[PDB]
Amino acid sequence: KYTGSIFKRSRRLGFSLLENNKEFSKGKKRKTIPGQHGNRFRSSTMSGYAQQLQEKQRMQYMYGITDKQFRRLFRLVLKQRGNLAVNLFRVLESRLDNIVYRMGFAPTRRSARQLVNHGHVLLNDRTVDTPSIILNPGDKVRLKAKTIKIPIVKAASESGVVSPFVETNNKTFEGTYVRFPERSELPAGINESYVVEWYKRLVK
Amino acid sequence: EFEERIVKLKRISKTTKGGRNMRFSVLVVVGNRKGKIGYGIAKALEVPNAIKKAIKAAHNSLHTIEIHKGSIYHEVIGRSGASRVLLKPAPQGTGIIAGGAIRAIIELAGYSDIYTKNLGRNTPINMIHATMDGILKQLSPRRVAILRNKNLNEL
Amino acid sequence: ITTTKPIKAHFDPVADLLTKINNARKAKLMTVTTIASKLKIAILEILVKEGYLANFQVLENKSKTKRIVTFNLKYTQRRIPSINGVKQISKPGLRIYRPFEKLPLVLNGLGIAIISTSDGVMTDKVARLKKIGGEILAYVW
Amino acid sequence: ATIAQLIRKPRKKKKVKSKSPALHYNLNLLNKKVTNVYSPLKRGVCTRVGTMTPKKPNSALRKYAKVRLTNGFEVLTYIPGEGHNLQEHSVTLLRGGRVKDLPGVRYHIVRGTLDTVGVEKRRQQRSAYGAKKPK
RNA sequence: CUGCCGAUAAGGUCUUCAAAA
RNA sequence: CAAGGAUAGCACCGGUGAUUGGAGUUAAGUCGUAACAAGGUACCCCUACGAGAACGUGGGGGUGGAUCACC
RNA sequence: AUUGGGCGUAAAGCAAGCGCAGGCGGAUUGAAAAGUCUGGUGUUAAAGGCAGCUGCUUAACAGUUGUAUGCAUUGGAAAC
RNA sequence: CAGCUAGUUGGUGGGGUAACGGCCUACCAAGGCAAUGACGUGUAGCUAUGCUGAGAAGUAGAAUAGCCACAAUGGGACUG
Ligand SMILES: [Mg+2]
Ligand SMILES: [Mg+2]
Ligand SMILES: [Mg+2]
Ligand SMILES: [Mg+2]
Ligand SMILES: [Mg+2]
Ligand SMILES: [Mg+2]
Ligand SMILES: [Mg+2]
Ligand SMILES: [Mg+2]
Ligand SMILES: [Mg+2]
Ligand SMILES: [Mg+2]
Ligand SMILES: [Mg+2]
Ligand SMILES: [Mg+2]
Ligand SMILES: [Mg+2]
Ligand SMILES: [Mg+2]
Ligand SMILES: [Mg+2]
Ligand SMILES: [Mg+2]
Ligand SMILES: [Mg+2]
Ligand SMILES: [Mg+2]
Ligand SMILES: [Mg+2]
Ligand SMILES: [Mg+2]
Ligand SMILES: [Mg+2]
Ligand SMILES: [Mg+2]
Ligand SMILES: [Mg+2]
Ligand SMILES: [Mg+2]
Ligand SMILES: [Mg+2]
């Protein structure tokens, strides 16, 4: 369940999935809002609601999430101790399909979701099929063995390009993760904290 | 880096001997996000000149703001005409729970966590008047020490 | 000390003093007089301990049948007072009784709250220290 | 006012009235008593079809209808759409609403539900007017 | 220096915008 | 002892009813022009009478009245 | 609008007065302790509420331990 | 919706009830409740709780759990 026109939505907001693969493309290098009504005036002065909603979509489209799932996670993190501005960032980045892409074993994020849904991934001591499990740093999320031989493992096994918060022990494909992602690994595509307040009005 | 944000753009007009003289009025809030904030309302035949004059007036009248731990120290009610704005101290994390003209003033002043509710009218000038009045009547916990001869806030 | 004017006071003893203080502050007056009562005497003693007024002298007549307390306010050099606002809680008719768990904190402790629990009038902080509450007279900040 | 005054005569809250009262009356028929039970939408039978003129700004011919619901209340309900099959005697499934042009009308006929036909030749916002997906 | 002196069909435009230079 | 039945007159509540009273709502109906300027007889409140109608007049009461004016 | 609103010109001060019951009410002393505050005990069924944990692929959910509110009785405090 | 209540209020001896009791009986009296709302009308199972609210509280008494009442309508009784 997702859109099949990721170029269009990435072109609208302006920010892609952090490699500009959906922005560079092989044609026209288009950086305008889609549709016929893209090259017009009235660009700035977006209302607070307007920019907040646009930004909220950015957060929940970077990961392929449904808004109702977003409300559940926000309700979960909200109650605990205090200014929890370090927890929900870890919570939002703890998605299982998200970690496999940051693991470097998938060409794209939503393709990693497909492999997760098809049962080609494992966990420290069990198996995982649902692409929504909330992970905690310390679990040895070891990959499958019958998928290391599939006709698409080449770029998968090229995990040498990997984020420092996903440690793999290269060539062993162990693929654990510690040292939770700092804001540096969460780029300026969505780096704001009044989206939390937007959900505070809409979600108790 | 005194950022500025329009808080209202009304369309005022007078009547002459045939026709209506129409002038735009802007309400700009200027703040350095460090403790200096002012407001300026100006009228002109066109929006650009009105904005320039309003910013000039706002920069001419800049008041000094003190912050305590990012929030407002004590709960206060600012009164201006029929508009009453309630400000309440907040713990670090809630964010600015304000909305509208008051929210613009609080962000431009520097304050972070702040509880507000507009208990009166919804006219932007009077709400800003009430917000600034409430923030200006605030007492630091060091002025009362010099006054009451206590020990620099010590119990 | 001698006088020339008749001294009157209101029937309600907390707000009578409160009105005197508030009117003097607004009108920049310093020395005021009122009739003396033991509840009124005790609240003035704690006020001068908290540093809101400068002096507080209770006096009696030459016959020992009447007493009037004449207090002055503590103005700084530039002539702005130390009291900012006064508000009475336990007004006549509706008397306010709050337990210890609900003892108020006025302006995060900047102001003082007058509470007469069992040992006369008593400040909010020391009331919290003894973990005992009761009648709440007025808010002073 | 005053604590003593409010103790004697407390604060009486203002009441609240509905916008579609005739939809919340149920007649039992075996005893012939009317109880107040709220119901979203109700079935009725039309008595007189025709047209009415809007208030002031608007100018047009709007198709009204005098429909008697399963209860015993006669309400003027607007037929919301372009073209109708009402034939003075028919059954309709009214809903809530309030057309601002015609004074007195406070209900709408759900289109394409029972005897009343759907609104064909419509591809936009069909789910509301009731038209089968072109497919 | 006070005579007399009544009426005027319906619905309607017009401010696009400051993001800025 | 007693449900129920028959007879009898009061009490409270509901529906309906020929005919009739006013009320609201209505783009372009008829008779005036009462009010808003000193609205062309200053207005308004209470009250009594009278008249197609707004309303007129008598009694009392107010300025929420114009003009006027003073070195 | 008890917390948390108003009554000259916007809705709202009865035409005015004599006034019982009710509400409020000068200063000081003594006692009692009905209000008021506080300690002990009993109770306020279980589920639900909030916090933590476990178990279902995680969740929803289930279980688990914690978590008040009022009433009565008893022992003290005496400022109003 | 301003009076209501004649076993209604009290005592006596007796009967009955698991038990106290005008619960019932004979006699003797005239009281009881009511403007701090009787009585009448209309409405409704109550509560733990559900939804909402910053709070005070508003709202419905889903499911389930405690208590009450009912079994076509109105009465009576056996067994235990
Ligand atoms: Mg001219
Ligand atoms: Mg003439
Ligand atoms: Mg005419
Ligand atoms: Mg006229
Ligand atoms: Mg004339
Ligand atoms: Mg006239
Ligand atoms: Mg005639
Ligand atoms: Mg006449
Ligand atoms: Mg007259
Ligand atoms: Mg007159
Ligand atoms: Mg008079
Ligand atoms: Mg009001
Ligand atoms: Mg008035
Ligand atoms: Mg008067
Ligand atoms: Mg009057
Ligand atoms: Mg008198
Ligand atoms: Mg009296
Ligand atoms: Mg006294
Ligand atoms: Mg319980
Ligand atoms: Mg459970
Ligand atoms: Mg007896
Ligand atoms: Mg019932
Ligand atoms: Mg609220
Ligand atoms: Mg239930
Ligand atoms: Mg049920």
Structure tokens at B72: 């407002």
Name D residues 3-42 whose Cβ lies under 7 Å from strand H.
35
Asked if residue A175 and residue A136 are part of one domain, the reply reads: yes
Asked if residue A194 and residue A148 are part of one domain, the reply reads: no
Alpha-carbon gap, residue C137 to C97, rounded angstroms:
10
Contact B38, B136 (CB under 8 A): no
Asked if residue A164 and residue A111 are part of one domain, the reply reads: yes
Asked if residue A79 and residue A98 are part of one domain, the reply reads: no
Alpha-carbon gap, residue C119 to C121, rounded angstroms:
7
Cα–chain center distance at D112 = 16
Contact A117, A129 (CB under 8 A): yes
AA identity, residue A153: V
D14-51 per-residue burial string, b: 16 or more CB within 10 A, e: under 16: eeeeeebebbbbbeeeeeeeeeeeeeeebebebeebee
Asked if residue A193 and residue A176 are part of one domain, the reply reads: no
Kindly state whether C108 is in contact with chain B, defined as any CB-CB distance less than 8 angstroms.
yes
Chains A, B in contact, 3 or more Cβ pairs below 8 Å: yes
Spell out where chain C has E strands.
Answer: 31-35, 53-60, 67-73, 86-88, 112-116, 121-123, 135-140
Structure's resolution in angstroms:
3.0
Look at phi and psi of residue D134 and say left if phi exceeds 0, alpha if psi is from -120 to 50, else beta: alpha
From residue C80, alpha-carbon distances to A12, B143, C29, C102, D27 in Å are 60, 12, 11, 33, 76
Interchain proximity B92–A83, CB inside 8 Å: yes
Q: How many structural domains comprise chain A?
A: 2
Asked if residue A96 and residue A175 are part of one domain, the reply reads: yes
Alpha-carbon gap, residue B106 to A57, rounded angstroms:
26
Give which of B72, B88, B115, B144 to mutate to test C binding, by max C Cβ within 10 Å. B144
Structure tokens at C100: 């210890």
Kindly state whether A80 is in contact with chain B, defined as any CB-CB distance less than 8 angstroms.
no
Asked if residue A122 and residue A72 are part of one domain, the reply reads: no
Residues within 7 Å (Cβ) of strand F: D 53, 55-56, 59, 103
DSSP at B151: B
Spacing, Cα A55 to ligand 7 middle (Å): 79
Spacing, Cα C121 to ligand 6 middle (Å): 71
Residue at token pair 């399963």:
D70
Shortest distance, CA C20 to any CA of chain D (angstroms): 24
∠ Cα D31 D34 D39 (to 5°): 125
From residue D118, alpha-carbon distances to B12, C107, D83 in Å are 50, 66, 10
Please check whether residue A203 lies inside any domain of the structure: no
Please check whether residue A82 lies inside any domain of the structure: yes
Contact A106, A125 (CB under 8 A): no
Structure tokens at D33: 């008593």
Asked if residue A87 and residue A13 are part of one domain, the reply reads: yes
Using DSSP's 3-state secondary structure scheme, residue A27 falls into coil
Q: For chain A, which chains pass the contact test of at least 3 CB pairs under 8 Å?
A: B
A204 touches strand H (CB under 7 A): yes
Cβ count near A61 (within 10 Å):
20
Please check whether residue A1 lies inside any domain of the structure: no
Please check whether residue A130 lies inside any domain of the structure: yes
Interchain proximity C110–B150, CB inside 8 Å: no
Q: Please state how this structure was obtained.
A: cryo-EM
Parent domain of A124 = 92-183
Closest CA-bearing residue to C1' of G26:
C11
Asked if residue A130 and residue A79 are part of one domain, the reply reads: no
What is the pairing mode between strands B20-31 and B36-44? Answer: antiparallel
Q: Supply φ then ψ for residue B117, to 5 degrees.
A: -150, 130
Closest CA to C43 of C86, C103, C107, C82: C86
Partner residues linked to B71 by β-bridges = B68
Q: How many CA atoms lie within 13 A of C12 on its CB side?
A: 16
DSSP at C58: E
Kindly state whether A200 is in contact with chain B, defined as any CB-CB distance less than 8 angstroms.
yes
Alpha-carbon gap, residue D6 to A54, rounded angstroms:
51
DSSP at A135: P
Using DSSP's 3-state secondary structure scheme, residue A101 falls into helix
Kindly state whether A84 is in contact with chain B, defined as any CB-CB distance less than 8 angstroms.
yes
Please check whether residue A204 lies inside any domain of the structure: no
CA of B20 to C1' of F32 (A): 38
Contact A202, A74 (CB under 8 A): no
Closest CA to B121 of B96, B101, B97, B98: B101
Identify all chain D residues contacting C93, using CB atoms and an 8 Å cutoff: 2-4
Contact C103, C127 (CB under 8 A): yes
Asked if residue A66 and residue A81 are part of one domain, the reply reads: yes
B126-143 per-residue burial string, b: 16 or more CB within 10 A, e: under 16: bbbbbbbbbbeebbebee
Q: What is the CATH number of the domain that holds A47?
A: 1.10.1050.10
Asked if residue A75 and residue A49 are part of one domain, the reply reads: yes
Asked if residue A101 and residue A65 are part of one domain, the reply reads: no
CA of B14 to C1' of F42 (A): 33
Partner residues linked to C31 by β-bridges = C72
AA identity, residue C66: K
